[PDB]
Amino acid sequence: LRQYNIVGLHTNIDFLLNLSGHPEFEAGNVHTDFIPQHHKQLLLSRKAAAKESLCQAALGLILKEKAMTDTFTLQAHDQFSPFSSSSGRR
Amino acid sequence: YHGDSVASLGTQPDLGSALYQENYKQMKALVNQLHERVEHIKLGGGEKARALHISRGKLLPRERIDNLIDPGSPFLELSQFAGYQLYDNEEVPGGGIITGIGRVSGVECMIIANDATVKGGAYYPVTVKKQLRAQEIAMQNRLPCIYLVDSGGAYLPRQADVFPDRDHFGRTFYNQAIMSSKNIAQIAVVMGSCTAGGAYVPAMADENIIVRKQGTIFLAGPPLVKAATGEEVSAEDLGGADLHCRKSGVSDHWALDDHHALHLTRKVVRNLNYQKKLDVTIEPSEEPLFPADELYGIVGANLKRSFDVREVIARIVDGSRFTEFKAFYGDTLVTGFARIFGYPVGIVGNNGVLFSESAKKGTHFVQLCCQRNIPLLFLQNITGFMVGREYEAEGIAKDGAKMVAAVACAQVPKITLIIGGSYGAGNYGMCGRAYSPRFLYIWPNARISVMGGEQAANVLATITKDQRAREGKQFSSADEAALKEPIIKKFEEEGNPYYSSARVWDDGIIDPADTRLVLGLSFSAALNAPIEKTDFGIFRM
Amino acid sequence: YHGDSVASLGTQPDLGSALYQENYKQMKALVNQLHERVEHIKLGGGEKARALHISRGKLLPRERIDNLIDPGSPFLELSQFAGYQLYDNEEVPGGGIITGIGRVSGVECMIIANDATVKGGAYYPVTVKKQLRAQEIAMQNRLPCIYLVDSGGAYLPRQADVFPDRDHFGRTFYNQAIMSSKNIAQIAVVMGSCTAGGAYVPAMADENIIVRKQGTIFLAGPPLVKAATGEEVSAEDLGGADLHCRKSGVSDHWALDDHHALHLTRKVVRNLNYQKKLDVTIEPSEEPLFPADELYGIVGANLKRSFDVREVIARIVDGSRFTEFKAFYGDTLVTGFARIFGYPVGIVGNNGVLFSESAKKGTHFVQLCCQRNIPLLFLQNITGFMVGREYEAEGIAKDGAKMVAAVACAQVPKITLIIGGSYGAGNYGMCGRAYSPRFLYIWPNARISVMGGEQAANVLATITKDQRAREGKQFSSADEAALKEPIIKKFEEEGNPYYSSARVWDDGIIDPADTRLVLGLSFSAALNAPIEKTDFGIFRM
Ligand SMILES: O=CCCCC[C@@H]1SC[C@@H]2NC(=O)N[C@@H]21
Ligand SMILES: O=CCCCC[C@@H]1SC[C@@H]2NC(=O)N[C@@H]21
Numbered sequence A: 001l002r003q004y005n006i007v008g009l010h011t012n013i014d015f016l017l018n019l020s021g022h023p024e025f026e027a028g029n030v031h032t033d034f035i036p037q038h039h040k041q042l043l044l045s046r047k048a049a050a051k052e053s054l055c056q057a058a059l060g061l062i063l064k065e066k067a068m069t070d071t072f073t074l075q076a077h078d079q080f081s082p083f084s085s086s087s088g089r090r
Numbered sequence B, C: 001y002h003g004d005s006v007a008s009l010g011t012q013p014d015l016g017s018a019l020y021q022e023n024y025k026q027m028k029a030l031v032n033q034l035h036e037r038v039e040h041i042k043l044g045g046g047e048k049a050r051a052l053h054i055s056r057g058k059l060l061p062r063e064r065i066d067n068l069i070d071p072g073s074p075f076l077e078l079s080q081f082a083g084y085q086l087y088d089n090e091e092v093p094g095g096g097i098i099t100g101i102g103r104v105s106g107v108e109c110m111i112i113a114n115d116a117t118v119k120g121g122a123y124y125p126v127t128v129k130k131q132l133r134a135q136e137i138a139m140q141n142r143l144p145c146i147y148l149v150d151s152g153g154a155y156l157p158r159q160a161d162v163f164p165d166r167d168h169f170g171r172t173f174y175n176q177a178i179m180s181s182k183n184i185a186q187i188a189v190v191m192g193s194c195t196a197g198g199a200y201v202p203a204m205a206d207e208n209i210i211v212r213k214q215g216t217i218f219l220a221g222p223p224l225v226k227a228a229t230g231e232e233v234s235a236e237d238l239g240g241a242d243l244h245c246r247k248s249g250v251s252d253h254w255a256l257d258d259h260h261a262l263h264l265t266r267k268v269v270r271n272l273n274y275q276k277k278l279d280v281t282i283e284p285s286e287e288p289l290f291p292a293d294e295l296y297g298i299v300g301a302n303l304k305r306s307f308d309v310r311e312v313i314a315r316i317v318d319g320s321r322f323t324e325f326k327a328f329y330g331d332t333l334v335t336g337f338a339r340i341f342g343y344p345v346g347i348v349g350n351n352g353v354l355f356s357e358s359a360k361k362g363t364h365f366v367q368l369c370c371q372r373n374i375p376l377l378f379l380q381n382i383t384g385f386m387v388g389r390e391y392e393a394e395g396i397a398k399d400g401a402k403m404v405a406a407v408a409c410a411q412v413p414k415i416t417l418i419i420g421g422s423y424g425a426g427n428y429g430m431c432g433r434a435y436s437p438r439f440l441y442i443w444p445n446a447r448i449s450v451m452g453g454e455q456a457a458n459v460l461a462t463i464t465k466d467q468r469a470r471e472g473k474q475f476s477s478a479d480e481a482a483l484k485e486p487i488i489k490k491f492e493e494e495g496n497p498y499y500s501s502a503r504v505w506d507d508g509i510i511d512p513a514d515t516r517l518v519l520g521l522s523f524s525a526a527l528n529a530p531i532e533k534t535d536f537g538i539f540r541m
Helices: A013-021 A023-027 A051-075 B018-042 B047-055 B061-068 B125-141 B156-161 B170-181 B196-204 B222-229 B240-248 B258-270 B295-299 B309-314 B356-372 B389-393 B396-409 B424-429 B453-471 B477-494 B497-502 B512-526 C018-042 C047-055 C061-068 C125-141 C156-161 C170-181 C196-204 C222-229 C240-248 C258-270 C295-299 C309-314 C356-372 C389-393 C396-409 C424-429 C453-471 C477-494 C497-502 C512-526
Strands: B076-078 B097-104 B107-114 B145-149 B186-190 B193-195 B207-211 B216-218 B253-255 B333-340 B343-350 B376-380 B414-418 B421-423 B439-442 B447-449 C076-078 C097-104 C107-114 C145-149 C186-190 C193-195 C207-211 C216-218 C253-255 C333-340 C343-350 C376-380 C414-418 C421-423 C439-442 C447-449
Touching (some): B018 B512, B061 B107, B061 B145, B076 B125, B076 B512, B107 B125, B125 B145, B125 B170, B125 B512, B170 B186, B186 B196, B193 B196, B196 B207, B196 B216, B207 B258, B309 B333, B333 B512, B414 B512, B439 B512, B447 B477, B453 B477, C018 C295, C018 C512, C061 C145, C061 C258, C076 C125, C107 C125, C125 C170, C125 C512, C145 C196, C170 C186, C170 C196, C196 C216, C207 C240, C207 C258, C253 C258, C309 C333, C309 C376, C333 C356, C333 C512, C343 C356, C343 C512, C389 C396, C421 C424, C439 C497, C453 C477
Parallel strands (some): B145 B186, B193 B216, B343 B376, B414 B439, B421 B447, C107 C145, C193 C216, C207 C253, C414 C439, C421 C447
Antiparallel strands (some): B076 B097, B097 B107, B333 B343, C097 C107
8 A cells, every 4th residue: 555656636545544553453353333433533634744855855856956967968068067967065 | 990909008906005095084184175165155145144134035056046046057166265264254155156067958158146145146256266266267168147136246345456456356347348349259147136246237138038027227326326416216217127237228137036937048058159179189088997085095094105196197087098109208297198978188297306308308398289270288296396407507497497488388188176285486497386277186185386495495595595604603403493484384285275265276176086077178178269379489598 | 857846827818708700700700710711722723733743743733742742741831821812813733832841751841833734834923932942941941942843934924033133033032042042952853844944943952853754944945945946856865864964964863753752752851961059948848728729709800899918828838837027017018938849939929009117127128038049929909009198208109119110130049829800010019021021921810911900091081171272172071981982892801811821921821729839840940040149239229
């Protein structure tokens, strides 16, 4: 389920992961009021992201910009110019 | 077919040798000294000035450049040390102006930004010279000019060195008009106040951008208006983006803030309809086979010791591949063909005292490069010309002049790097500042003057020893150092790299480990202009 | 680096609004009227003439073009409405000639084919003008000319308007000789009879193709030969492919039928040793962000109502991206940079009455485009110049002249599109027909004349109200419309797009939904010629 990924619309994938995680489901004590009885546990609010995760996102924007620089370089006559590096060095 | 195996330059230095250890230690200290001084210059006017600048909603001058250039692209700053201790009691970090070459919308451009935190952006005499040097670089290489204008006018206490002469403030507008006539785009971004001559910069530009409230343009400031006509008017009403954008028409684009103006500038450059074309053959780039930091141990800081210039070459050229020309003739000079970042280059470097054979060998080499349209790189480490009765009888001056005359007329791009001493006529033969090299850089250990400090001391020690021996009053050895010590101190102080760089004699002091990168960026920029045919004068055979 | 996000033009129109509903309905009717009239013109002479033409084994003129051009390639036909109601009792569909630009063997060429079904291919005065316009287009853009010759000679009843003058039939051969001297290939395909001046066309061509039996080339026809010398000879014997191919040598290639001749023509073009080269920078194409058919509702057919020209721009430029120049200065004129099918273009469009600021803004913009070698597109929707004592005192005429003079001297390719009114000197400033735009198109709702119909009526209503008030006989209100109604009718009739297009004043009436495609094809053809440097006259400051 964690490798099933969808972008562009809302989905029940998160709810399914929470339900599978719930301890009672793992025990096998399943009843049809499971969703009403455990409604508070199954639906959970987003937590603040860790600084590490924010670092990864920042790296992703930087690397995507590097790819965009590379695309322009292929079209350009001066392919080996030091300026086309994304070194950000002064 | 390019599959031939070839020999490579360079040898592994003896890291354990005491000489290498000492040379590395001395050069490292110079580089560390250079780095920390730049850090201080990076701060401009200071915390109070910077805090005031930001309090008005304006970006800091260096943050403006960071946002203007393409993301992650390198920026080649020029003359970082202009104005360093130039004026007795006034500190002018970087001369009050930041100039350099960066990539905007994929196009190499010259960026000239006033530093409003330094003396409110007033134009000191060095500030004019630094800007004029930047414009000269842009014109010679056909680089579009972007002016981030935030200035406070000329520095009245030193007006005589700013206003009147040909190379004074007036020349700035002359350069703008000439570049515009040549289709070298001139873009001005008014991000602050510009008064008197400053107002001409946006007016003389091909396309112009002004910020909503910060920017102000007026020939006469409010203070002059009140004195002349007794009227009180705010700067915004007299100038301002709205007045020029909507009523005066001086403004071509209207920007909300500094970020918006920089975004607009990138759009303007993208519409220049310019595409770079290369006149030279290109080959894939390769890194040198030896580490660059080994240059610290090899070169050191003692100019009296000598090193093989080939070692320097082996650590900057692609693959450390070098084809030497006339290797065994005039061995004090090294000439050959190589490639830096794929570009072809002809390298001329000193390896001892210049002789008649060396000058002839250089003159022959320069003709070859001009014929094939190959850029030239000069590595100046000079100690003078050969001195002797026989050499003069054989026309050493005639031979030395042959090289001065070939170097001057060469039309291929020329870049000079002073890695050692630069004295007397040897400077001219090796493409000194007077010979219009596209760029000129110096290492932190370099020395430049009319002659070496010792020679001037010894020469005087002959003239006054003679003065009193011939006159007849005896002149003793202690009288000799009351003559020699002041001379040596003067030449040491005035030949220092910082003294040379504080005034704009070179385009910057560079770390030796950065030599390859700086040369690669410089040659890449110089190739924006087509290479012309070289016309020589009469070669005095 | 081209990854910057930018703003886009255009807004979503209110489809429910009554104005949009009415405007769409009116414009749609005009487009439907335009389509069905072209369908009738498509049939040429008629069923009897077409049946006779096919009975001789010859292809119909439009089928010849279909087989000549590359499979599936678009064909840009020009002046479809030439001769529409031009002559009192004679119907001349398309002027008796079909001209357009298509791709042959991958090369853009100008195709000029006589329509033998229309008056037997005789040359009416409009026929000469249409052909001369096609030749002018080919020369200005360096497009090879292909002549599908099937003609019956000049129309004797109107000889005075065909033979004598500089822009009369004689100029056709002059143009062929000039283009040949410039290496613009001239290819003639004799697919029928050509007599008197017609025989010169194959003779003046660089390479020539003739069909086996249909084609005939005689300076003097059989009727003249009999009268002059009393000899009876058939056209084939006097001319014919065999005589010219094998004995006279006038024929370079011999073709069995129409299909064979068209196949030979494609081979001839493939041997021109020509390859297209672009002087401008290119970027990937993108469709506009808004539907083109919305132009029906936005524009409508009522010239009194006003619309924002930016809406028209937003629906034809790549990605609806537009960089406006001097947006807040002279707002009645819109200028900016965009791209159509990847080509860079500078757009000038009317958004109200022309003012002094608007003219100055236009003059500045035109200089920018000429400096950067950027093609110019003009969108004419004019209503006149500002009228006022103050404006004349400030030299509105001087300002308006600045733009007429810059537009005339511009050497970049220029294309004009009349999307509204075109009156008086406003026509000249916006690159009218007199200023040699590479192409000129008009929308079905356009009106063109020396002045608006109402202004001429009102002006006369002042002159004769004065005439009788000053003379003293009273001139009543009913006497006013016996003056005004004939004037308004005349200007409405002579300003109609069909009246303008029947004569060759424009290159065609185009559906607004097709504006982007037509501009893309036109600019692509115009880029076959290198862009020259622009030399300006004196700018009267
Ligand atoms: O001279 C003292 C200050 C007030 C008079 C100066 C006049 S005002 C007109 C003219 N323009 C200037 O910038 N200065 C003079
Ligand atoms: O003039 C009446 C018709 C027969 C004589 C005309 C002569 S024939 C020689 C010359 N060439 C022409 O085309 N017309 C005249």
